[PDB]
Amino acid sequence: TKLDEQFEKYPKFEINKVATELNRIIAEYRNNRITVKFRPGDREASEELAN
């Protein structure tokens, strides 16, 4: 506001409290990573193919 012919601004404080759960989820993922796995079939030589 003008506030006697100036433009002093409103104070705007931040207390971030919503990132804790997101960091928890990210840590949960990075603790147990996953990767594509190929499973064999009912054949005589499918195990070598999967390997």
Partner: protein, 80 residues
């Protein structure tokens, strides 16, 4: 209203004294005058007050908050 106010402000010239009935009439007329010219400013919002997420704002329209005054920036006069 105007006549009674003028009478009140001018009666002292002839050295008399107003009577309570005339005073009451003047007050009533002045009240009737003042009733017709009210203001009721109806104060606005603040300016940093967030607007709800239910109003469905957009990026290029801004209005994440109620509109307010905005600073003036000049690069020639070092006010800072």
């Amino acid at each position: 209203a105007v006549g009674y106010q003028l009478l009140l402000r001018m009666l002292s010239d002839y050295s008399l004294e107003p009577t309570p009935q005339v005073l009451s009439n003047a007050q009533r007329s002045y009240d009737a005058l003042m009733t017709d010219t009210l203001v009721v400013p109806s104060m606005r919002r603040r300016g940093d007050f967030p607007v709800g997420q239910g109003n469905k704002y957009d990026v290029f329209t801004s209005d994440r908050y109620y509109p307010g005054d905005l600073p003036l920036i000049d690069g020639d006069i070092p006010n800072a």
